[PDB]
Amino acid sequence: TLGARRGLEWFLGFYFLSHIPITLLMDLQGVLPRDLYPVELRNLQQWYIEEFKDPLLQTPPAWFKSFLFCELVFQLPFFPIAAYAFFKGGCKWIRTPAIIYSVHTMTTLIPILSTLLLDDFSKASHFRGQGPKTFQERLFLISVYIPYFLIPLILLLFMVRNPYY
Amino acid sequence: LGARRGLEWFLGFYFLSHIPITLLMDLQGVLPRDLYPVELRNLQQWYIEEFKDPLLQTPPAWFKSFLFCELVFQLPFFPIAAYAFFKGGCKWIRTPAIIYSVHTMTTLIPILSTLLLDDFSKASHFRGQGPKTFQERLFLISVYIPYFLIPLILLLFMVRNPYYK
Ligand SMILES: COc1cccc2c1CCC[C@@H]2CCCN1CCN(C2CCCCC2)CC1
Ligand SMILES: COc1cccc2c1CCC[C@@H]2CCCN1CCN(C2CCCCC2)CC1
Ligand SMILES: CCCCCCCC/C=C/CCCCCCCC(=O)OC[C@H](O)CO
């Protein structure tokens, strides 16, 4: 049947494939004009921000907004190329690109996960009551961001040590 | 000499000088300043007052995480990378230097974006600590931009130089 290395490649292929609709229809609504999005998709983002209490994608600060422009200009073009590579197999030319993507993404989420778990989101802060208030509400939000840090770390370890790449 | 060997000399001097820069300056906002002598505390207070640095003294959550990354991840790599480019022809530094380059570049994209585009008034969360004029934003970007360009050169150097593949 399928192997261990090939199984991770299929799992990584769906990660890069599913990241395309997640970036376009969700994350980029904080940097791109609202008029590029239909009303049905603009309310879907608000369902997330209200339920998960996300203070970043709601109104992005300057540091978070710079990571979103990286996702549009650098990460988004790489997603289809990486998906095709790990679905086909034997594409060694992706080793250095996948390392660059992994290290970059992981470095974007260390300040994100640190802010969501340690920063203050009360009315006295600049977030002005928009954000997780309880420890359970912080992990409920960290749960959505943690797959985008763990999966790239898996890709970094895979690329550095795999002799077939 | 030559451009390649000269760049390795320049890179070695970058990683060697980054050791006193990190220990004696940048880590004063992550480590307790009781461990620093009065003179080293006063030199940082001079830089914060003269250059109007809004991040180094009282770092936000996102800026603190990078300073911890600079301590746990970057500082141990500085002597190894200095030896690799001073000696020359250390092909084992390629992937480790790529990881440092993409990490440090991703660290400063939000910093440069914040210094140039964010609001540093008395009503902002920085409480008038930052720079107001465009002139001092360049005075502050000038001390942060070499840590984006030199890692950018390193990334392009390791990706294409056949003497490290
Ligand atoms: C039926 O379930 C759903 C339906 C609709 C949406 C969602 C779910 C399930 C859970 C919540 C999601 C909404 C996704 C929002 N997140 C996208 C990734 N983003 C990161 C990417 C990396 C760079 C930093 C930002 C963080 C935000
Ligand atoms: C006699 O003049 C000097 C003497 C000593 C030092 C300096 C000067 C004058 C020029 C300024 C320097 C001090 C620079 C301080 N910066 C170092 C890099 N650091 C990191 C933060 C994390 C991301 C990477 C960059 C931010 C702070
Ligand atoms: C006293 C002040 C001291 C500091 C003063 C400021 C120094 C600015 C230096 C910039 C280096 C630029 C190097 C550019 C090298 C070529 C880039 C290139 O060709 O890039 C191709 C591209 O990356 C393919 O994707």
Q: Which two tokens stand for residue A87?
A: 């679905």
Cβ(B95)–Cβ(A99) under 8 Å?
yes
Which method was it determined by? X-ray
Cβ(B141)–Cβ(B66) under 8 Å?
no
Q: Which two tokens stand for residue A46?
A: 């608000």
Query: Alpha-carbon dihedral of residues A25, A119, B65, A62, nearest 10 degrees?
Result: 50
**Given an 8 Å threshold on Cβ–Cβ distance, is A66 in contact with B95?**
no
Measured CA to CA in angstroms, residue A152 lies from A12, A73, A82, B74, B115 at distances of: 9, 18, 12, 19, 29
Q: Which two tokens stand for residue A81?
A: 């190329």
A50 CA → ligand 3 middle, Å: 43
Distance CA A135, CA A132 (A): 8
Measured CA to CA in angstroms, residue B165 lies from A38, A125, A162, B100, B128 at distances of: 48, 49, 16, 17, 49
Contacts with B125 from chain A: Cβ below 8 Å? 125-126
Contacts with A160 from chain B: Cβ below 8 Å? 95
B144 CA → ligand 2 middle, Å: 7
Tell me the CA end-to-end span of chain B in Å, nearest whole number: 21
Helices (H), ranges, chain B:
3-24, 38-51, 61-69, 75-87, 94-117, 134-141, 146-160
Distance CA B94, CA B81 (A): 10
Cβ(A104)–Cβ(A73) under 8 Å?
no
Chain centroid to CA A16: 10
Distance CA B129, CA B57 (A): 10
Cβ-based neighbours of A4, under 8 Å, separated by 6 or more: none
For A5-113, strand residue ranges (E) read none
Phi, psi of B97, rounded to the nearest 5 degrees: -75, -30
Cβ(A102)–Cβ(A155) under 8 Å?
yes
Resolution (A): 2.9
Distance CA A50, CA A66 (A): 23
**Given an 8 Å threshold on Cβ–Cβ distance, is A67 in contact with B110?**
yes
Q: Under an 8 Å CB criterion, which residues of B touch A?
A: 60-66, 69, 95, 98-99, 102-103, 105-107, 109-111, 113-114, 117-118, 124-125, 155, 159
Measured CA to CA in angstroms, residue A107 lies from A103, A153, B102, B105 at distances of: 6, 11, 9, 9
Determine which helix (DSSP H) or strand (DSSP E) holds A23, and give its type and residue range: helix A4-25
B18 CA → ligand 2 middle, Å: 10
**Given an 8 Å threshold on Cβ–Cβ distance, is A96 in contact with B159?**
yes
**Given an 8 Å threshold on Cβ–Cβ distance, is B110 in contact with A160?**
no
Q: In which residue are the tokens 């300057």 written? A: A62
